[PDB]
Design a protein around this ligand. Structure first.
Ligand SMILES: Nc1nc2c(ncn2[C@@H]2O[C@H](COP(=O)(O)OP(=O)(O)OP(=O)(O)O)[C@@H](O)[C@H]2O)c(=O)[nH]1
Ligand SMILES: Nc1nc2c(ncn2[C@@H]2O[C@H](COP(=O)(O)OP(=O)(O)O)[C@@H](O)[C@H]2O)c(=O)[nH]1
Ligand SMILES: Nc1nc2c(ncn2[C@@H]2O[C@H](COP(=O)(O)OP(=O)(O)O)[C@@H](O)[C@H]2O)c(=O)[nH]1
Lengths: 611, 433, 428, 43, 428
């Protein structure tokens, strides 16, 4: 039958969402977005809960003040409608399927007393929409911005009544008032004198005195909602670098501001002079309060989640993630509690039991597409879209060598021989260039190439004499690494994204965009069988157990399936991925399964069979 | 022991020399640090220093930065001595007057000083290999002034150019015919052999045989780099027919003025066409003689082959070389000039061509034909016609004359080209006396 | 290492130069505070073309912002990238523009130009080697017409070996925003003709049409209007600031562009232009970039190229791209449109390529064209001047501020003598 | 606690040295052409 | 490499093409979004016949949509496959079609034809070897009657070596949905004769005959009618997009089916057509394809083929099928129905076979036939013309928009002259 594996741990936080990481007023749960789901994380007991159902990536998340309703947005395709799923918390169900916007949802806020929700739309619509909470339909709405200005970037309710929208954006500061008797919104523009600023982060106080706007010019401007006119301006000198992208108005007197360079400052507003200043790596995007405000939760744009104290400003890195897409995870030959994951700008190694970063290489902006450890464990080989193959130190992060201009359109897959002498590369043009590594030299042995498309993955026989190269032109070549030519050539009607030898090397197991797993003979390259494996979505990434009984798969269906080899029905099936799965790997101890996806999430499983 | 100094003038010269030294370091096994990992073949294009650093014998001259700065901030920053890379401060701006008269004097003394300092650390200097175009202000005027000063100071030396000629169709600039006419008029008497390479013909080669669809100039510069790395291969490795720069000099230049050969190459195959091909001696000789691997856009059948040298590189046998030459001398499509019965210079080497991470295939044989033919009379003539049509009513003449240029040198350059075409015609026809 | 001194004159020039500074700050990575926060070292490698280094990495642009009335200065200072400019090089004057060339040139401009020349001299002395000056202004109106051309005259007298680019907004026939635009443009063109080495005429009607049909915009405001002007600003100076095969700076564009010193009036073009809805259906590639570059609707001046013969053309490309595709497409357009190119100038298109495209895109192309068709602008302005001058109308202010009839007659005769060569080369 | 190695040179995504990608998608070459009398190109 | 530029004119042609793009995207595996979600790689190899590109592999057709009424484009956009076309290819006009040939041809139609031809060129020079322009229109009515023939005339003048494939909906004898369909049909055929190489007559009464007697539908829709028309659209062009034994593209079809350049008026048929009930009692193979493809019941033009001999005929098959099937059965038909093929031409049957059939089937066949039976189609319109032209009625708009009586006499004389070879070659 179809069982479930276990949700051990998930590592992921989409920090690109403005006002992302939140804190429920239960004081003990974090609300943070990642992929097409929202994660519940209890801080003290560390259990993960998933908020499933969104047919694209999240764009904004907000919670009600009373703390029983949660709203989220989408980044859905051009022309199609976006949706807001109005969640309740205590039983965690899809209560309502609000949908009006011809683009992406971009700002969301609940009323002080939960009666109304506001749905400031995207850069294609530019509209404000009110939805009632009791009936769960919309009441009224209008174009959010004037026709002489930009768009509106953030929206907020009042805090003592339910009637005072504030919308801000590219010079579009407006204070809207509801008129539910005749059911229409009244817009009122704001003029800050000669100032024409671009707004990223908006907030206000517990009472309705003033609302604060952090601008892209690095100043905080306080405005009086009632009289509808600017009042004070921010740090005349020492304007915050980049721009104030995350602001929160504390209850007592003060403000928390966060720049695009991570310059968390507790300021007070006759002059906005920094009283307590903290540098944090990554652009501060979300600032949330743990209740009254003795502890904070700062979500940076680099997927770093920080927890600081207001009384002394000391910092506890509690969750570090992948800020863009992941593309490969590997395990060294031996210990299974260290695994390395590559990404769009960086390679990081993780301790498994603590789920914690230990070393990060931060090669600036170029995408890695695959890594592999050497058998002796003294260098991590990495394929970049540079056309280069780097060798990073396994403990301290050093360039032992860079293989320059190796492959024309990037290097996509790498593999290392067991004798610790050959690295086999594969790139966009389809070359299977083999490089020999000595004490100080690296040489090109011979450019094996037949392919007409990218080389998705390269696997090497345990005798380091045979290798198989899955290609996206529907070809898997059994090369021959003693005399360097082709033995067998498997041809199909798909785009292989994953190939894997049998552990005692008879049949290669291939899958890809056909949604069909196939076992292939290596005598003449014939097909043994052709079984199913995805309802709708390309299957990307496979790994057999070292024993040779079961393998693991996960693809565009956001759902990992563990298959049997002699059988081939689904044995066990895990769910929880918020995006396109790119790879799956079984640990060398045959205990855990590490699955990496395209939203930036590292999920860990239990390999639930003792073989 | 047999060294020659490389000079790289202009943006074309700097990028071609970037590809050239990229080929040279992997040829002699030198890492881009100067160190050679663990024999006199490196002494010619590289110079030994303590702790094993191998500095190139090159002078990269450009009147404007950021092209030198690509080298100074690239992967080859430690290979070059950071003073040899010589920069100006203002772009010569496609103007021969700026290149040779006004902004050439702020760097000509420094460039000659470093030419002298590189030359003195050299026992037997074979000459100069100078890479430029007939195009931009730097690559025309500065190389004209360099030919002037090198004729004064080392007048007995050999000066071989590897020039980027303006294509008869595609071109780059409006001011191309003016600049080309002036640089070749000033450089006719001081240049001694000029190997002619045209970008549109490289385009046709890399489009037709090398299977690239959208290549930048880097592939063109690499293809020029292979040609120079195999004209200079026998003074580096050992073969059977050891040929040198002065050998090429005597063999390719019949008359004092008539010193413009075309360079052509053997297999430019891109390895989905090589395993299905013999890649023998006779067929690659035929491929070089074919009127499609010509590297300037002119028809050899619209002309006369007059003196050529074959440079065979790799596993070649002299009997097959002789058989190929005997087969070529029989076909009437390729016809020689009646007064030159010995029109072939054979030079063979035992070193196979290397492969750089690039696009050219692993081959065991290569041929460079360096051929002085009369068929480039037409290629001179179209650019002369462009010069006439643009010189009719003072187009862009004020830009020249306002910088220091005299108007009469446009004229005397035109009659010098008229005399060059007259010399080509006079050597063209068969003897009747 | 080469650099440009930027000058903004008038309300039009100040707003256009402001949008220039947002675009250049976005390209290089300077935030509104002045700090360098980029991602590539190539942006910082040639940062000394537009930004003088300040204390603590607070790079300040070398722009002199001048207007005869302190109303646009506060708008630029209170704009988004307003705290990037030095608070001392804001040279204003507590007076009125008058939209009068006499009032801008032979009056208060002549008594502010000492201060302006002092600031421009300070910026032009804070130099390793300068390449020249660019000035943003509008011929139609005051300040930029009078004092802008006055500053052009003084700077050309002071520094005669430097390249001048003048981006000038020229009046349109469909609509005028000032009734003495013919007089002001006439007296400004009289000084632009023998002074500047490169002029870039920017027409509001043609730019509005670009915002209509290519961009599919509903309400293109002035901020969306001057953005394309800033794009064609950055196109001509790209290779000065960024590496690439076949670089081209302002001086080599000039020496490759103008065959005669009088004929230096161009028309610009920027052609990765896609609408918001039609962007997803585009397949951004060299042939269609060249197609949109040579299409007679992206032309920034209101002069159709189909009623004239191109003297010279330049295309400054940005982005990683094939120069087979470049050279082949430029010869396709040169051979397909043979009657639109002069036959006495062979290969009359200059090509430039840069590695770095604008941010938010992959491939761009800036078109700079010296065409014949500038008559459809100049003869238009001359017809308006002839219709207005004969009645001695809107002219007593000009005479009362210190002008004679002879200078007006000389200006009109100089446009007749400027339209004469650019028509006699239309018939060879 | 977290160890870093920032690369000393900050490269750009447009200065890379390879062969440029065909705008026609390479696996199923789409806008497409032939060579001068025939060819399935190189990808 | 052969591309087809697709043109949609009129309401009828707009819906016919706006069903053809759905059926061809179902064949090629393209979703409404525009990306490829298919099963076999053999589809994507030859989709440069109807589809131009976009970034990210989001394929977009090369169809120029045009109508003088901006109401049909809204329905096409809101339809199922509406978000796949270029919004710049939506060339419309804020005017009235008016079911008027003069109003579509010598007026606002001619005011819009320049903007249409600009988009036609923008699709045309973005190719390698353009071979054919398809145009979908209705002869009876407006837009497609006037602007369709104007567009065909201009396109044939511009490109005189490429073939016109005009799918035209002719008026029916049973019904008319406009009073002036005889006038529009006569005037449109006047330019269709000496401009087009493959004119395909589609008759709505014949489509109801197929949908009622053969397909057996109770409540047919215009969507179903356009579905059969779209089936023969894809059937004619299948040899360009899918591989198979003995391919035959459009020009090789035209060379074999046009004996004389005036005799190019064809009439098509599609025949794996079964009712939902009687699918069970078919014997799915070639003999029933051959009978259902040769009969006078599946013929999409309502003119009986038994009334006049087939001059030439092509039958392009699709599906994995050996050629015993084809050669044996078409020779059998040619031998036994010898009195219905003219004897002066031996073996007047053309064969082509494609490997992949349409989706959901196994074996399909598409008839195209140059028959004598088009004589009735043109003759009936000739008496419908001369019934109204003698009284000079329904004609003052024709005179008022700028036409003349001699134009109508020339059109009727040309079509009466076209009625001559179709009867002389029928009577040998
Ligand atoms: N292989 C190669 N050839 C080039 C390159 N750049 C320019 N060329 C050739 O040179 C011609 C124009 O550039 P150059 O003549 O080199 O310009 P320059 O010598 O640097 O002088 P300036 O333009 O003043 O900087 C073109 O026609 C090209 O054929 C390059 O980067 N690589
Ligand atoms: N492109 C562009 N043109 C502008 C802008 N602001 C003003 N203009 C033009 O400038 C012209 C008049 O400016 P002008 O009166 O000379 O300003 P002044 O120099 O301060 O007197 C008008 O025709 C406007 O079209 C702008 O922001 N962008
Ligand atoms: N096949 C097909 N024919 C249609 C469709 N809609 C209309 N027609 C035919 O088109 C004819 C009239 O169209 P027409 O007047 O030319 O359209 P208009 O000129 O744009 O208003 C009618 O006789 C209909 O039979 C359709 O959706 N499919």
């Amino acid at each position: 039958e179809v069982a479930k594996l276990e949700l051990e741990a998930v590592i992921g936080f989409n920090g690109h969402v403005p006002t992302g990481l939140k804190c429920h007023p239960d004081q003990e749960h974090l609300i943070y977005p990642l992929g097409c789901t929202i994660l519940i994380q209890a801080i003290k007991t560390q259990e993960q809960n998933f908020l499933h159902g969104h047919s694209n990536n999240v764009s904004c998340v907000t919670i009600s003040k009373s703390g029983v309703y949660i709203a989220s947005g989408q980044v859905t395709f051009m022309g199609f409608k976006a949706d807001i799923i109005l969640w309740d918390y205590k039983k965690r169900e899809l209560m309502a399927r609000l949908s009006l916007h011809k683009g992406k949802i971009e700002a969301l806020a609940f009323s002080p007393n939960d009666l109304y929700l506001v749905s400031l739309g995207g850069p294609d619509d530019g509209s404000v929409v009110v939805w009632s909470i009791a009936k769960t339909e919309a009441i009224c709405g209008s174009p959010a911005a004037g026709l002489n200005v930009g768009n509106a970037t953030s929206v907020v309710f009042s805090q003592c009544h339910d009637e005072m929208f504030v919308t801000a954006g590219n010079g579009t500061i407006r204070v809207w008032e509801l008129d539910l008797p005749n059911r229409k919104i009244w817009p009122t523009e704001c003029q800050t004198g000669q100032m024409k600023r671009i707004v990223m982060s908006i907030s206000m106080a517990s009472d309705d005195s003033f609302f604060y706007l952090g601008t892209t010019t690095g100043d905080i401007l306080k405005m009086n909602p009632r009289t509808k006119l600017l009042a004070d301006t921010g740090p005349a000198k020492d304007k915050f670098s980049l721009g104030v992208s995350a602001i929160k108005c504390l209850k007592t007197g003060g403000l928390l501001v966060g720049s695009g360079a991570g310059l968390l400052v507790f300021c007070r507003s006759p002059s906005y002079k920094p009283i307590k200043k903290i540098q944090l790596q990554g652009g501060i995007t979300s600032i949330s309060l743990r209740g009254e405000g003795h502890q904070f939760f700062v979500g940076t744009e680099e997927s770093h989640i920080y927890r600081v104290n207001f009384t002394d400003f000391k910092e506890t890195l509690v969750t570090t993630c992948h800020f863009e897409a992941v593309e490969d995870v590997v395990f060294p030959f031996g210990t299974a509690e260290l695994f390395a994951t590559c990404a769009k700008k960086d390679i990081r190694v993780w301790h498994t039991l603590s789920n914690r970063e230990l070393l990060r290489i931060t090669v600036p902006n170029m995408t890695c597409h695959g890594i592999d450890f050497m058998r002796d464990g003294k260098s991590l080989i990495s394929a970049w879209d540079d056309g280069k193959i780097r060798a990073f130190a396994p403990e301290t992060g050093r360039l032992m060598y860079v293989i320059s201009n190796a492959h024309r359109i990037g290097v996509t897959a790498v593999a290392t021989t067991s004798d610790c002498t050959r690295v086999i590369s594969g790139g966009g043009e389809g070359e299977v260039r083999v490089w020999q590594i000595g004490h100080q030299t690296q040489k090109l042995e011979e450019a094996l190439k037949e392919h007409k498309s990218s080389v998705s993955c390269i696997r090497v026989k345990k005798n380091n004499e045979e290798c198989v190269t899955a290609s996206t032109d529907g070809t898997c070549i059994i090369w021959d690494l003693v005399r360097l030519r082709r033995n067998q050539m498997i041809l199909a009607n798909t785009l292989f994204q994953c190939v894997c030898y049998h552990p005692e090397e008879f049949q290669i197991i291939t899958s890809g965009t056909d949604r069909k797993i196939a076992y292939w003979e290596v005598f003449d390259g014939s097909g043994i069988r052709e079984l199913d494996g995805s309802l709708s979505g390309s299957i990307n990434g496979m790994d057999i157990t070292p024993e040779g009984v079961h393998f693991v798969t996960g693809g565009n269906d956001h759902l990992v399936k563990v298959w049997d080899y002699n059988e081939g029905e689904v044995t066990h099936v895990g769910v929880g991925h918020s995006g396109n799965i790119t790879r799956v790997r079984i640990s060398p101890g045959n205990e855990y399964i590490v699955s990496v996806s395209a939203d930036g999430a590292i999920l860990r499983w239990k390999y639930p069979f003792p073989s | 022991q047999r060294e020659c100094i490389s000079v790289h003038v202009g943006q074309a010269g700097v990028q071609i020399g970037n590809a050239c030294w990229e080929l040279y370091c992997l040829e002699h096994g030198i890492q881009p640090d100067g160190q050679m990992p663990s024999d006199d073949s490196f002494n010619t294009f590289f110079s030994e220093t303590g702790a094993g650093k191998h500095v190139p014998r090159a002078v990269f001259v450009d009147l404007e930065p950021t092209v030198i700065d690509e080298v100074r901030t690239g992967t080859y920053r430690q290979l070059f001595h950071p003073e040899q890379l010589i920069t100006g401060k203002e772009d010569a701006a496609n103007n021969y007057a700026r290149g040779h008269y006004t902004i050439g004097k702020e760097l000509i003394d420094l460039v000659l000083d470093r030419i002298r300092k590189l030359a003195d650390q050299c026992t037997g200097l074979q000459g100069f290999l100078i890479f430029h175009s007939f195009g931009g202000g730097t690559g025309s005027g500065f190389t004209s002034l360099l030919m002037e000063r090198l004729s004064v100071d080392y007048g007995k030396k050999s000066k071989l150019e590897f020039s980027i000629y303006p294509a008869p169709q595609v071109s780059t600039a409006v001011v191309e015919p003016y600049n080309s006419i002036l640089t070749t008029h000033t450089t006719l008497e001081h240049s001694d052999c000029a190997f002619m390479v045209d970008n549109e013909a490289i385009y046709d080669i890399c489009r037709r045989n090398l299977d690239i669809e959208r290549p930048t100039y880097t592939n063109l510069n690499r293809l020029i780099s292979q040609i120079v790395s195999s004209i200079t291969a026998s003074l580096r490795f050992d073969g059977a027919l050891n040929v040198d720069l002065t050998e090429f000099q005597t063999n390719l230049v019949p008359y004092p003025r008539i010193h413009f050969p075309l360079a052509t190459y053997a297999p430019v195959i891109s390895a989905e066409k090589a395993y299905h091909e013999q890649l023998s001696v006779a067929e690659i000789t035929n491929a070089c003689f074919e009127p499609a691997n010509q590297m300037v856009k002119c028809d050899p059948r619209h002309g006369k082959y007059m003196a050529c040298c074959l440079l065979y590189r790799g596993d070649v046998v002299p009997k097959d070389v002789n058989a190929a030459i005997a087969a070529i001398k029989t076909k009437r499509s390729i016809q020689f000039v009646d007064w030159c019965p010995t029109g072939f210079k054979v030079g063979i080497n035992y070193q196979p061509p290397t492969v750089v991470p690039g696009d050219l295939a692993k081959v065991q044989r290569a041929v460079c034909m360096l051929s002085n033919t009369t068929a480039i009379a037409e290629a001179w003539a179209r650019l002369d016609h462009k010069f006439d049509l643009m010189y009719a009513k003072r187009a862009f003449v004020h830009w020249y004359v306002g910088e220091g240029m005299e108007e009469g040198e446009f004229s005397e350059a035109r009659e010098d080209m008229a005399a060059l075409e007259k010399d080509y015609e006079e050597v063209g026809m068969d003897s009747v006396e | 290492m080469r650099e440009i001194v930027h000058l903004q004159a008038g309300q039009c020039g100040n707003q256009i130069g402001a949008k220039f500074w947002e675009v250049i700050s976005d390209e290089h990575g300077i935030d509104p505070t002045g700090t360098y926060h980029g991602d590539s070292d190539l942006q910082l490698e040639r940062i000394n073309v537009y930004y003088n280094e300040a204390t603590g990495g607070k790079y300040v642009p070398r722009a002199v912002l001048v207007d005869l009335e302190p109303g646009t200065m506060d708008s630029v200072r209170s704009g988004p990238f307003g705290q990037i400019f030095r608070p001392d090089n804001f040279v204003f004057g507590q007076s009125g523009a008058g939209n009068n060339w006499a009032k801008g040139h032979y009056t208060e401009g002549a008594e502010l130009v000492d201060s302006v020349l002092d600031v421009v001299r300070k910026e032009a002395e804070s130099c390793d080697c300068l390449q020249g000056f660019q000035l943003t202004h509008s011929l139609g109106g005051g300040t930029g017409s009078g004092m802008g051309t006055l500053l052009i005259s003084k700077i050309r007298e002071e520094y005669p070996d430097r390249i001048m680019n003048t981006f000038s907004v020229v009046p349109s026939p469909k609509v005028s925003d000032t009734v003495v635009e013919p007089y002001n443009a006439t007296l400004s063109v009289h000084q632009l003709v023998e002074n500047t080495d490169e002029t870039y005429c920017i027409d509001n009607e043609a730019l509005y049409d670009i915002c209509f049909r290519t961009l599919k915009l509903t309400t293109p405001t002035y901020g969306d209007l001057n953005h394309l002007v800033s794009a064609t600003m950055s196109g001509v100076t790209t290779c000065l600031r960024f590496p690439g095969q076949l670089n081209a700076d302002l001086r080599k564009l000039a020496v490759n562009m103008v065959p005669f010193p009088r004929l230096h009036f161009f028309m610009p073009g920027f052609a990765p232009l896609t609408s918001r809805g039609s962007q997803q259906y585009r397949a951004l590639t060299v042939p269609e970039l060249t197609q949109q570059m040579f299409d007679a609707k992206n032309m920034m001046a209101a002069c159709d190229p189909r009623h004239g013969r191109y003297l010279t053309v330049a295309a400054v490309f940005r982005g990683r791209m094939s120069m087979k595709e470049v050279d082949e497409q430029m010869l396709n357009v040169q051979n397909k449109n043979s009657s639109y190119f002069v036959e006495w100038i062979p290969n009359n298109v200059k090509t430039a390529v840069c590695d770095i495209p604008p941010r938010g895109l992959k491939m761009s192309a800036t078109f700079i064209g010296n065409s014949t068709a500038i008559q459809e602008l100049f003869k238009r302005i001359s017809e308006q001047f002839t219709a207005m001058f004969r009645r001695k109308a809107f002219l007593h202010w000009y005479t009362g501020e210190g002008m004679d009839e002879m200078e007006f007659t000389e200006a009109e005769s100089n446009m007749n003598d400027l339209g004469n060569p650019v028509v006699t080369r239309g018939a060879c | 606690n977290i160890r870093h190695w920032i690369n000393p040179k900050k490269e750009s995504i447009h200065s890379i040295q390879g062969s440029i990608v065909s705008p026609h998608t390479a696996a199923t070459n789409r806008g497409y052409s032939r060579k001068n009398d025939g060819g399935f190109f190189s990808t």
